[PDB]
Ligand binder design. Structure first.
Ligand code: COO
Ligand code: COO
Lengths: 265, 265
């Protein structure tokens, strides 16, 4: 009945802050599947998940998706070592607040990995010739570079890129990531699975590893597990690879809208 | 392995504070035995206990009694209602800090009951004719006024007052309060049991209910369960009934030193 990533938390009466602590491990669920150069890093998507549940455990809301993510900076990666404790802090109001996700050293030393801003949620054909692409080349490309994705993250079963740069991918939630997923507000693997569609976009498909540093405008409208198609596009600005993905269900309705996915090497 | 009164706690990284939360109940151990006018109030002694364990769970010390209590204000009593949550906050350093003990309303409203100051611990015959007194008159007196003590708090098995005002009492730890006592740093019933020796002092024994508001200089040197004698004395200053008790073991060595026990109606 407890969120395996946020952990239980209490409120600090001296100020207005609220803290959360959670035990992390490479054995926790699908964490082992994300790997950057043989290390169990934490996927960027996860932070967004934790940032939302914090506002949910703090405020009373009678909606299935009352929160949207405004800004999401990611300062340093998190090596998931055994016995790692994850510390989260919330501060603000129900219209808008702030969330910091840090890692604890001993008991009085911490290292922040992601600062966030959360607010209330908002309301909901010419020459794009697709060249059918093999996913096991991307995965291989991605893995080759140094991003050995795990089975639970191999959700792209089919994908192609248009003659303009936009990438279209048929995604699904593999069963290994389906274990213990009702506790989430926004699955962290899907959101990554939606993000890795940027590996097929034109600007990406000529650099022969890219990591997402900052997000902006992450909108959730429905349970994102019911998603089968993601449309990925990105541009560049020197070192500013800005992106934009959208995850939609069978009937074309939107589920996940990510306005800006600024990336870097 | 967890303190039943302090509860588990986590550290707030936004500031330097550390919070603790604990479930309280009238069914918890000997809590039901303390009663003020048919209500399960929390005994003053308990706060001192919680204030010490907070500094112990916060700082590394290789001593059996490294902390002493400097000041202990008690603002409002705590009606122990079922499902009551107790909130404790620590702030300061290992040489000297501050502790607040409050009660939580819902999740974001609190009421402080006792502020405290804690610091490092310090190093360790003429006309006093005693008139042997019956404890079951004091208890009756005390109960009569409106302080129906419980069995676990009936530790005074023999007491007398000298021809000057000082009260001497042979105290013991009843078995009903002996259940689950290794978890404490300073038993809260004993300290009360040492305090109720002030009910035999001269200034007290002519008012025919007194409550302790503020303490000062509470020194602990040993496990206070091994105590068999308490020497109680107090004076008055209008509404300022200042006291002083000391709990000693069999071989006369001191165990509990309370410099000031300012009381009021
Ligand atoms: C996908 C793989 C893993 C994941 O899923 S996690 C995804 C997100 N998390 C990450 O792994 C990225 C974490 N960090 C990085 O990789 C990124 O840092 C990075 C390693 C790229 C880039 O290194 P920097 O630390 O320099 O980048 P910053 O995050 O500090 O911000 C960019 C820029 O702004 C400046 N900046 C930003 N914030 C601050 C502050 N606070 N103070 C001073 N200066 C600042 C800083 O000088 C930086 O200079 P350059 O990056 O060299 O251009
Ligand atoms: C033994 C029975 C139960 C126990 O074991 S618990 C033992 C300790 N706990 C208690 O039950 C006592 C709790 N409270 C009381 O009983 C005590 O209040 C009391 C009910 C007596 C006395 O009432 P007060 O609230 O007035 O007393 P204070 O604690 O506020 O302090 C004394 C005095 O200083 C002033 N004061 C002190 N702190 C403040 C602040 N912060 N702001 C403004 N003014 C303040 C205040 O005006 C007070 O005026 P009087 O008491 O009327 O003389």
């Amino acid at each position: 009945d407890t969120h395996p990533l946020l952990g239980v938390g209490v409120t600090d009466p001296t100020n207005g802050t609220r803290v959360w602590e959670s035990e992390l491990d490479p054995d926790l669920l699908w964490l082992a599947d994300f790997v950057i150069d043989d290390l169990v890093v934490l996927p960027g998507a996860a932070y967004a998940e934790i940032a939302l549940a914090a506002a949910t455990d703090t405020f009373a809301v009678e909606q299935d998706q009352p929160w949207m993510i405004s800004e999401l900076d990611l300062r340093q990666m998190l090596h998931v070592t055994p016995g790692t404790v994850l510390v989260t802090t919330l501060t603000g109001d129900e219209q808008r607040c702030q969330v910091e996700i840090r890692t604890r050293s001993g008991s009085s030393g911490w290292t922040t990995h992601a600062t966030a801003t959360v607010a209330r949620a908002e309301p909901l054909t010419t020459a794009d010739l697709e060249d059918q692409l093999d996913p096991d080349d991307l995965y291989q490309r991605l893995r080759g570079a140094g991003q050995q994705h795990g089975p639970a993250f191999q959700g792209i079963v089919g994908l192609a890129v248009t003659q303009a740069g936009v990438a279209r991918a048929q995604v699904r939630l593999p069963a290994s990531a389906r274990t213990g997923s009702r506790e989430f507000m926004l699955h962290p693997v899907m959101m990554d699975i939606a993000l890795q569609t940027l590996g097929a976009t034109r600007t990406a498909t000529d650099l022969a590893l890219v990591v997402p540093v900052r997000f902006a405008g992450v909108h959730v409208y429905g349970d994102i597990t019911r998603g089968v198609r993601a449309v990925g596009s990105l541009a560049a600005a020197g070192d500013r690879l800005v992106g934009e993905v959208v995850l939609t269900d069978a009937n074309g309705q939107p589920l996940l809208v990510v306005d800006e996915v600024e990336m870097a090497v």
